[PDB]
Design a protein around this ligand. Structure first.
Ligand SMILES: CC(C)=CCC/C(C)=C/CC/C(C)=C/COP(=O)(O)OP(=O)(O)O
Ligand SMILES: CC(C)=CCC/C(C)=C/CC/C(C)=C/COP(=O)(O)OP(=O)(O)O
Lengths: 230, 231
């Protein structure tokens, strides 16, 4: 007290399966508890004044998992709209999603878009869902849009700068001093980066903890925000 | 007794040269020569263990802000490395290559690096990859800029733009494709930041952070990192 507080926190949610397996619970059950954890962390971050949280929800590598697990994860955003979005909306939380939408189920996409439309005037923490998201994939579509704007002569290749590429990423919709996470948290002891915000996180502080994501709570968020330092 | 999985490509963020020198009542710059000394040891030790590539982050484009003197001292480093160290890497079958923006390097530095390359270009052992005047976002921007230029020239259709394609335009394009991406990225001196190092290529790397300062990082410390690698 007082610590510097990260304005934008990225979160890689690991341990849902381990958390469920450790408790003699089905694997998928763990992913709902991870969503339960997110409500706690999202509320707690809002209390401390964090401006943005980007949580990695469903990476593009994830579709390989057995259909059932995919079907179960994809239903998660449906209950979140019915059962969780009201409390975040009551807490002034803005919900946004980045990632590839075209390949989502309809019930999932509608629940996400409704959650957005519900909260679009809210002025607190922005909960930014990364769904069907991959960093390399994100940069490639941005490089494609730029190629197409270069052929259309809206921009000359000379106009392509770091500032410019930033305006074409899926995080373009965040305000500019908040587009890049100040901190990226990964739980469950994994020290890999897994294609999460490779551009935007290029200078981020990293925080790795053995705590499993469903066990990550206000206290664990606070252990991470203190440890932020520079 | 059992074998450890060993990373084929190791990225190394060399931190702590200044801390190392201040801790030893030595001038700040002296630590950076010791940082280069550490690199010979680490480079030699990795070659013994069978690592195919090391990309060491030498001079990031943000580093030019430092006092001219420190820059002047670092930039002379590749001259002594050619005279005093490249022969031993060459005797050890080490290939020397550099990635980053060369156009804005001093001439004695660029010439020492390019000769170092030409001397060792046929060597078939570990590839010591110097990242000099390098920044990941800048690397990707030049990669995305050239592609826009090849699309206007109609060499590639916008439809040909894939992840595999962007990979061929990065500074790591000259490496073999199964080796372009580091399997492990080491950062010394306790820093848990990424500092713009291979943002594309390292997207899936295992990370290893150690409090050891770079000039004290040796074969033993390299082995602590290759062991800790796991999958
Ligand atoms: C969009 C939305 C409402 C999200 C709410 C929370 C949610 C759906 C989290 C699931 C994220 C995910 C795929 C975790 C995989 O962990 P894992 O199975 O790799 O964990 P393990 O390493 O223990 O197996
Ligand atoms: C052949 C060749 C190029 C050899 C160079 C070897 C060498 C001196 C590498 C160190 C590069 C560097 C700028 C270190 C500064 O670390 P710091 O202690 O200032 O770290 P910080 O970013 O954590 O402050």
């Amino acid at each position: 007290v007082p610590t510097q507080v990260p304005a934008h926190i990225g979160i890689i949610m690991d341990g849902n399966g381990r958390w469920a397996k450790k408790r003699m619970q089905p694997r998928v059950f763990g992913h709902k508890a991870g969503m339960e954890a997110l409500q706690t962390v999202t509320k707690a971050a809002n209390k401390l004044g964090v401006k943005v949280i980007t949580v990695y929800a469903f990476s593009t590598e994830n579709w390989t998992r057995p259909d059932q697990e995919v079907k179960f994860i994809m239903n998660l955003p449906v209950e979140f709209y019915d059962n969780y979005v009201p409390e975040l909306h009551a807490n002034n939380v803005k919900i946004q999603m980045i990632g590839e939408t075209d390949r989502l189920p309809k019930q999932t996409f509608e629940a996400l878009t409704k959650a957005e439309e519900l909260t679009k005037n809210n002025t607190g923490l922005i909960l930014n869902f990364a769904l069907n998201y991959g960093g390399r994939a994100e940069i490639t579509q941005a490089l494609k849009l730029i190629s197409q704007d270069v052929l259309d002569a809206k921009i000359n290749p000379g106009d392509i700068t770091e500032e410019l590429i930033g305006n074409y990423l899926f995080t373009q919709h965040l305000p500019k001093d908040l587009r890049d996470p100040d901190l990226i948290i990964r739980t469950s002891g994994e020290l890999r980066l897994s294609n999460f915000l490779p551009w935007q996180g290029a200078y981020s502080e990293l925080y790795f903890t053995d705590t499993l994501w469903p066990d990550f709570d206000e206290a664990a968020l606070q252990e991470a925000i203190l440890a932020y330092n520079r």
